[PDB]
């Protein structure tokens, strides 16, 4: 076949009932996820081609940078609780990964500031048991799929996307391949 099992994408062994529709999985700390955001604009341009009536999921995971890993998935709880995913993503990668100004949560915190988010906002949200029901979601999600590696992203909790079977020569190649696999596997 065109698509096959073990070559864009791996079927789990083990199916989770009720996930997300797409579900994707990215650190601050991962390098491809970097790549994912910056240069590739992945989930874009994934949801560009899914289907009518998909929602999309992305989630930060806690096994990448020991402590701050786990503030950056609060971090990450934040920004959804107050939707500006859109604000923050950037500039906490660049902050992590390019200029390394982001060692502590207070770093954290001042990437929030500067996109305009207020203090007592940020700290409130930080605290509120609607961010820690939000990271208990975070990681549920990444627990019941056994994730040992990031970027990754799952359709329908049964299959799994597999980049590494994909052509790299081309960028926007590889991409359109990406999220033309998203959307088979979401016919299926």
């Not at 990450?76 to 995913?85: D, F, T």
């Given at each position: 076949a065109q698509y096959e099992d073990g070559k864009?994408?791996?079927t789990l062994e083990k199916p989770v009932a009720g996930a997300p529709q797409v579900l994707e999985f990215f650190s601050f700390?991962?390098?491809?996820?970097?790549?994912?955001?910056?240069?590739?604009?992945?989930?874009?341009?994934?949801?560009?081609?899914?289907?009518?009536?998909?929602?999309?999921?992305k989630y930060h995971v806690n096994f990448m940078g020991g402590d701050l890993g786990k503030d950056l998935t609060q971090a990450?709880?934040?920004?959804?609780?107050?939707?500006?995913?859109d604000k923050v993503t950037v500039p906490l990668f660049e902050g992590v990964q390019k200029t390394q100004t982001i060692r502590s949560a207070s770093d954290i915190r001042d990437v929030f500031?500067?996109?305009?988010?207020k203090g007592e906002e940020y700290d409130a949200a930080w605290n509120s048991f609607v961010v820690k029901s939000l990271v208990a979601q975070q990681e549920k999600a990444a627990a019941d799929v056994?994730?040992?590696g990031v970027p990754a992203m799952f359709v329908n909790g049964k299959y799994q996307l597999n980049p590494q079977g994909m052509d790299t020569?081309?960028?926007?190649?590889?991409?359109?391949?990406?999220?033309?696999?998203?959307?088979?596997?979401?016919?299926?």
């Open positions: 864009q994408y791996t700390f991962c390098p491809h996820c970097y790549q994912f955001e910056e240069v590739l604009h992945i989930s874009d341009n994934v949801k560009k081609k899914l289907p009518e009536g998909v929602k999309m999921t990450w709880a934040v920004a959804m609780a107050l939707g500006v995913e500031i500067n996109a305009g988010i056994q994730l040992r020569s081309n960028m926007d190649v590889f991409v359109q391949q990406y999220a033309d696999t998203v959307k088979y596997l979401s016919e299926k």
